[PDB]
CSV table of C-alpha atoms and ligand atoms in Angstrom, one decimal:
chain,number,residue,atom,x,y,z
G,1,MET,CA,3.8,-35.1,27.3
G,2,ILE,CA,6.4,-34.4,24.6
G,3,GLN,CA,9.0,-36.8,23.3
G,4,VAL,CA,11.7,-35.9,20.9
G,5,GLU,CA,14.1,-38.0,18.8
G,6,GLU,CA,16.7,-37.4,16.1
G,7,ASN,CA,19.1,-39.1,13.8
G,8,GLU,CA,20.9,-38.3,10.6
G,9,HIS,CA,17.7,-38.7,8.6
G,10,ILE,CA,14.9,-37.4,10.6
G,11,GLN,CA,13.9,-35.4,13.7
G,12,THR,CA,10.6,-36.1,15.4
G,13,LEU,CA,8.4,-34.8,18.1
G,14,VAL,CA,5.4,-36.6,19.7
G,15,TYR,CA,2.9,-34.5,21.7
G,16,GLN,CA,0.0,-36.0,23.6
G,17,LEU,CA,-2.4,-34.5,26.2
G,18,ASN,CA,-5.5,-35.8,27.6
G,19,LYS,CA,-8.9,-34.2,27.4
G,20,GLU,CA,-9.4,-31.8,30.4
G,21,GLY,CA,-10.3,-33.8,33.5
G,22,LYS,CA,-9.9,-37.2,31.8
G,23,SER,CA,-7.6,-39.8,33.5
G,24,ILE,CA,-7.4,-42.4,30.6
G,25,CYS,CA,-6.3,-41.3,27.1
G,26,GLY,CA,-8.2,-42.8,24.3
G,27,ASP,CA,-5.5,-42.0,21.7
G,28,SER,CA,-2.3,-44.0,21.3
G,29,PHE,CA,0.9,-43.7,19.1
G,30,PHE,CA,3.9,-45.7,18.3
G,31,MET,CA,7.2,-44.3,16.9
G,32,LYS,CA,10.5,-46.1,16.0
G,33,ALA,CA,13.3,-44.8,13.9
G,34,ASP,CA,16.6,-46.4,13.2
G,35,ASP,CA,19.3,-45.5,10.7
G,36,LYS,CA,17.4,-47.1,7.8
G,37,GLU,CA,13.7,-46.6,8.4
G,38,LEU,CA,10.8,-45.1,10.4
G,39,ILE,CA,7.6,-46.7,11.5
G,40,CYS,CA,4.9,-44.7,13.2
G,41,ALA,CA,1.2,-44.8,13.9
G,42,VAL,CA,-1.5,-42.8,15.6
G,43,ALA,CA,-4.8,-44.1,16.6
G,44,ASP,CA,-8.0,-42.8,18.3
G,45,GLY,CA,-10.2,-45.4,20.0
G,46,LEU,CA,-14.0,-45.3,19.7
G,47,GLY,CA,-16.1,-45.3,22.8
G,48,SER,CA,-14.7,-44.1,26.1
G,49,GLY,CA,-12.8,-45.0,29.2
G,50,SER,CA,-10.7,-48.2,29.3
G,51,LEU,CA,-12.4,-49.5,26.2
G,52,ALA,CA,-11.2,-46.6,23.9
G,53,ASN,CA,-7.7,-47.1,25.3
G,54,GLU,CA,-7.9,-50.9,24.7
G,55,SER,CA,-8.6,-50.3,21.1
G,56,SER,CA,-5.9,-47.7,20.3
G,57,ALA,CA,-3.4,-49.5,22.5
G,58,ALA,CA,-4.0,-52.8,20.6
G,59,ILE,CA,-2.9,-50.8,17.5
G,60,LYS,CA,0.2,-49.4,19.1
G,61,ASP,CA,1.2,-53.0,20.1
G,62,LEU,CA,0.6,-54.4,16.7
G,63,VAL,CA,2.5,-51.7,14.8
G,64,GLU,CA,5.5,-52.2,17.1
G,65,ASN,CA,5.4,-56.0,16.7
G,66,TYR,CA,4.8,-56.1,13.0
G,67,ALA,CA,6.8,-53.0,11.9
G,68,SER,CA,8.7,-54.9,9.3
G,69,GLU,CA,5.5,-55.6,7.3
G,70,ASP,CA,4.0,-53.4,4.7
G,71,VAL,CA,1.5,-50.8,5.9
G,72,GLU,CA,-1.5,-52.4,4.4
G,73,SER,CA,-0.6,-55.7,6.1
G,74,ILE,CA,-0.1,-54.0,9.5
G,75,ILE,CA,-3.4,-52.1,9.2
G,76,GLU,CA,-5.3,-55.3,8.4
G,77,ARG,CA,-3.9,-56.9,11.6
G,78,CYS,CA,-5.1,-53.9,13.4
G,79,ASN,CA,-8.6,-54.2,11.8
G,80,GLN,CA,-8.8,-58.0,12.9
G,81,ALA,CA,-7.9,-56.9,16.5
G,82,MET,CA,-10.9,-54.5,16.6
G,83,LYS,CA,-13.4,-57.4,16.3
G,84,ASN,CA,-15.2,-57.5,19.7
G,85,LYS,CA,-13.6,-54.1,20.6
G,86,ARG,CA,-14.8,-50.5,20.3
G,87,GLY,CA,-12.7,-50.0,17.2
G,88,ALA,CA,-10.4,-47.1,16.3
G,89,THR,CA,-9.5,-44.6,13.7
G,90,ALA,CA,-5.9,-45.0,12.7
G,91,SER,CA,-3.0,-44.0,10.4
G,92,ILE,CA,0.2,-45.9,9.7
G,93,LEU,CA,3.3,-44.3,8.1
G,94,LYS,CA,6.6,-46.1,7.0
G,95,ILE,CA,9.7,-44.2,5.6
G,96,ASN,CA,12.7,-45.7,4.0
G,97,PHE,CA,15.4,-43.1,4.3
G,98,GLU,CA,17.9,-44.3,1.7
G,99,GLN,CA,15.2,-44.2,-1.0
G,100,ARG,CA,13.4,-41.2,0.5
G,101,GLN,CA,10.2,-43.2,0.1
G,102,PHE,CA,7.1,-43.3,2.3
G,103,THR,CA,4.1,-45.5,2.5
G,104,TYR,CA,0.9,-44.6,4.1
G,105,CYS,CA,-2.4,-46.2,5.0
G,106,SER,CA,-5.3,-44.9,7.1
G,107,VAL,CA,-8.9,-45.5,8.0
G,108,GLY,CA,-10.9,-42.7,9.8
G,109,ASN,CA,-10.2,-39.2,11.0
G,110,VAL,CA,-6.6,-39.3,12.0
G,111,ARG,CA,-5.0,-36.9,9.5
G,112,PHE,CA,-1.6,-36.8,7.7
G,113,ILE,CA,0.0,-33.9,5.9
G,114,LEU,CA,3.4,-33.9,4.3
G,115,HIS,CA,4.7,-30.6,3.0
G,116,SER,CA,7.5,-30.4,0.4
G,117,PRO,CA,9.9,-27.4,0.2
G,118,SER,CA,8.7,-27.1,-3.4
G,119,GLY,CA,5.4,-26.1,-1.9
G,120,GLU,CA,3.6,-29.4,-2.8
G,121,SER,CA,1.7,-31.1,0.0
G,122,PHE,CA,0.4,-34.6,0.3
G,123,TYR,CA,-2.9,-34.1,2.3
G,124,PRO,CA,-5.3,-36.9,1.8
G,125,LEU,CA,-8.9,-36.6,2.7
G,126,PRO,CA,-10.0,-38.7,5.7
G,127,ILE,CA,-11.4,-42.1,4.8
G,128,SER,CA,-14.9,-42.6,6.3
G,129,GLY,CA,-15.6,-45.1,9.0
G,130,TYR,CA,-13.1,-46.8,11.4
G,131,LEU,CA,-11.3,-50.0,11.9
G,132,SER,CA,-14.1,-52.2,13.3
G,133,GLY,CA,-13.0,-55.8,12.4
G,134,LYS,CA,-15.3,-55.8,9.3
G,135,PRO,CA,-13.8,-55.9,5.8
G,136,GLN,CA,-11.9,-52.9,4.4
G,137,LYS,CA,-10.8,-51.7,0.9
G,138,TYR,CA,-7.5,-50.1,1.9
G,139,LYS,CA,-5.9,-47.3,0.0
G,140,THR,CA,-2.1,-47.3,0.4
G,141,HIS,CA,-0.1,-44.4,-0.9
G,142,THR,CA,3.5,-44.8,-1.9
G,143,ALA,CA,5.7,-41.7,-2.9
G,144,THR,CA,9.1,-40.2,-2.8
G,145,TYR,CA,9.7,-37.2,-0.6
G,146,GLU,CA,12.3,-34.5,-1.1
G,147,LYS,CA,14.9,-33.5,1.5
G,148,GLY,CA,13.6,-30.8,3.8
G,149,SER,CA,10.0,-32.3,3.8
G,150,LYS,CA,8.0,-31.8,7.0
G,151,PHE,CA,5.0,-33.7,8.2
G,152,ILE,CA,2.3,-34.1,10.8
G,153,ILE,CA,0.0,-37.0,11.8
G,154,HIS,CA,-2.7,-35.9,14.2
G,155,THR,CA,-5.9,-37.0,15.9
G,156,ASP,CA,-9.1,-35.1,15.8
G,157,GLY,CA,-8.3,-33.4,19.1
G,158,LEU,CA,-6.1,-31.0,17.1
G,159,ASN,CA,-8.2,-28.7,14.9
G,160,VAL,CA,-6.1,-26.1,13.0
G,161,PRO,CA,-7.4,-23.9,10.2
G,162,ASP,CA,-4.3,-24.0,8.0
G,163,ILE,CA,-1.9,-26.8,9.1
G,164,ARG,CA,0.1,-26.5,5.9
G,165,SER,CA,1.2,-23.0,6.9
G,166,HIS,CA,2.6,-24.2,10.2
G,167,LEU,CA,4.6,-26.9,8.5
G,168,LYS,CA,5.9,-24.4,5.9
G,169,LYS,CA,7.0,-21.8,8.3
G,170,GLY,CA,8.6,-23.9,11.0
G,171,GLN,CA,12.3,-24.6,10.8
G,172,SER,CA,12.4,-27.6,13.2
G,173,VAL,CA,9.9,-29.9,14.9
G,174,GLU,CA,10.2,-28.0,18.2
G,175,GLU,CA,9.3,-24.7,16.4
G,176,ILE,CA,6.3,-26.3,14.6
G,177,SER,CA,5.1,-27.7,17.9
G,178,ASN,CA,5.3,-24.3,19.6
G,179,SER,CA,3.5,-22.8,16.5
G,180,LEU,CA,0.6,-25.1,17.3
G,181,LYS,CA,0.4,-24.2,21.0
G,182,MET,CA,-2.8,-22.1,20.8
G,183,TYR,CA,-4.8,-25.2,19.5
G,184,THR,CA,-3.7,-27.3,22.6
G,185,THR,CA,-4.9,-25.1,25.4
G,186,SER,CA,-8.7,-25.9,25.4
G,187,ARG,CA,-8.2,-29.7,25.9
G,188,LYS,CA,-11.8,-30.4,24.5
G,189,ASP,CA,-10.6,-33.9,23.3
G,190,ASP,CA,-7.5,-36.0,23.7
G,191,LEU,CA,-4.9,-34.5,21.4
G,192,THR,CA,-2.0,-36.4,19.8
G,193,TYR,CA,0.4,-35.5,17.1
G,194,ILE,CA,3.6,-36.6,15.6
G,195,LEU,CA,5.9,-34.2,13.8
G,196,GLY,CA,8.7,-35.0,11.5
G,197,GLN,CA,11.4,-33.1,9.6
G,198,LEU,CA,13.2,-35.1,7.0
G,199,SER,CA,16.8,-34.6,5.8
O,1,MG,MG1,-10.5,-37.8,19.3
């Protein structure tokens, strides 16, 4: 499944495909852009079956409902919802277009890379553990992006040797998605990513 969106400030693409032979996806995402801001999130539930989905879906729902809150507030609501669930790894990104500012918070192995035309990339290491409902010490990143920046948020189903290179070379989110096609054919795990290109 691919879904694309565009406005004056960003173009996005969401790709999601299940593990080969698996009916219920354990990954979830949420994406919403208006003329002023973007909210998005990607999550990968622990365990299997309906229980992995229950966990990542709870995140999708909370990010949509609480989108106006700061990322660390949203992720903490997500953490509380994991109590008595399998838990999930997750990443939450908010962008304010007028300021060209983004904020980011994550726990676990859902990765985020933002590539600047200047050749700088924001590429945090994964934070160990997962959202389990137990106490977290969140790390929130706040920074300015330059026009022309491109980014990806992806679950562990996408395993690419040099993701930065794909972002640098691609001229649109459709091109970057096509550039990643060889990593999507095996379907060893659920695979979810969100691409963005920022004006
Ligand atoms: Mg996974």
